[PDB]
């Protein structure tokens, strides 16, 4: 069985683009190559790390389950989750965002340090995707995250990386001078992934449990 994805790319269907999810979903498939790029894939400008590696791993996946790794209301009590939308990801004329990624903003004039983790008990490898925001201007960084020395730390037994986003104005892509770089990792069963950040973090909302046999 193949996986047909609209006009969309692999990133668009896996990131949760507002227009991509309305077309197709699937669990068992063997072919994934539909459209490379320059399509509905990334509604927000950014760089997808290890895109070709993710394409190879995602190819020929027997079982695929979509689950909420972090509930929207429960996971982040001291941050605002409803403020994160953009016109570049607009759906049906209303500003929207990725369905699998949730934008985290400040609440009540503060952005407290966050530490959230997920333990994998699904007996299947879990695909976790997140993003790090790179504001175009320093003033926007202070307004949304209330910190200039932003840090995002994703640490697990198999994967470990610390991101320090830097404010840099970039050429306008999809009416957004700012950028959000996307990163992903695979969580082996029995392992826990830790998220620590003071801001500029696009925390995961939905994850995918997959098997390759």
């Amino acid at each position, epitope marked *: 069985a193949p996986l047909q994805l609209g006009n969309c790319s692999i990133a668009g269907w896996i990131l949760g683009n507002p227009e991509c999810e309305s077309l197709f979903s699937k669990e068992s498939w063997s072919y994934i190559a539909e459209t490379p790029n320059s399509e509905n894939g990334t509604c927000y400008p950014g760089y997808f790390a290890d895109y070709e590696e993710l394409r190879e791993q995602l190819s020929s996946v027997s079982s695929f389950e979509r689950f909420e790794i972090f509930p929207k209301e429960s996971s982040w009590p001291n941050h605002t989750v409803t*403020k994160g939308v953009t*016109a570049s990801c607009s759906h049906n004329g209303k500003s929207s965002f990725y369905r699998n990624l949730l934008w985290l*903003t400040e609440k*009540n*004039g503060l952005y407290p340090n966050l530490s959230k983790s997920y333990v994998n008990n699904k007996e299947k490898e879990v695909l976790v995707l997140w993003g790090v925001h790179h504001p175009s201007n320093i*003033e926007d960084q202070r307004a*949304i995250y209330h910190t200039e020395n932003a840090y995002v730390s994703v640490v697990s037994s198999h994967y470990s990386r610390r991101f320090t986003p830097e404010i840099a104005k970039r050429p306008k892509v999809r009416d*957004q001078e700012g950028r959000i770089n996307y990163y992903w990792t695979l969580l082996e069963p029995g392992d826990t992934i830790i998220f620590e950040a003071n801001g500029n973090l696009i925390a995961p909302w939905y994850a995918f449990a997959l098997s390759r046999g």
Partner: antibody
Amino acid sequence: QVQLVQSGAEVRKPGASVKVSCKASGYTFTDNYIHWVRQAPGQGLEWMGWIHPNSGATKYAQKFEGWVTMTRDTSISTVYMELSRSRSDDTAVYYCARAGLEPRSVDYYFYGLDVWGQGTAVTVSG
Amino acid sequence: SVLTQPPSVSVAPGQTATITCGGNNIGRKRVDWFQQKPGQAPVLVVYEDSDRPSGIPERFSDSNSGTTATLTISRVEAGDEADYYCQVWDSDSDHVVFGGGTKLTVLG
């Protein structure tokens, strides 16, 4: 209902310390920013700065930078605005406004000014 | 940023009055309008896209249309006579710059 009651009328000599209070009631004090504007008699509004009760952060305008100072007191839900040095041109009505209008998008993440005070008549012109 | 407003705009009752606020203000940039009656604190009338907050009549509408800010009041009544200001947020300094002000006169 949510309201901001300001201090009474003030008369000062040039170079004096003009301090204006702004008491908040009807809502959680440490929620939104408090903005200060100055209106010369029969003139437009001039933005001075903002202070957030929760964090205490202050960002003043270039015209008012240095000689104005915004403080806060969470115990009494009062924000203060002290002008260290005063002049005749500073004679105006000073308003304190609450930024209770939550934004909608990160592209336009600003807290709009919805609840205003009553004004404080500051006449220096000593 | 600097926002320029006409000193006074005259409209007869029943007609439609348009107040102009100029400057490099991009497409939306919030653009908030305030109403100041004599001897009274300013009150917000429209924010974001239209969005009359509490009791502001539906006759009030805020349309940008390019590098200009426009406030439109239809079927102007006596109560609409006040001074209207335009306010944006310059994201290059996070400063809430106000407009010059417009005295809307309902010709009686």
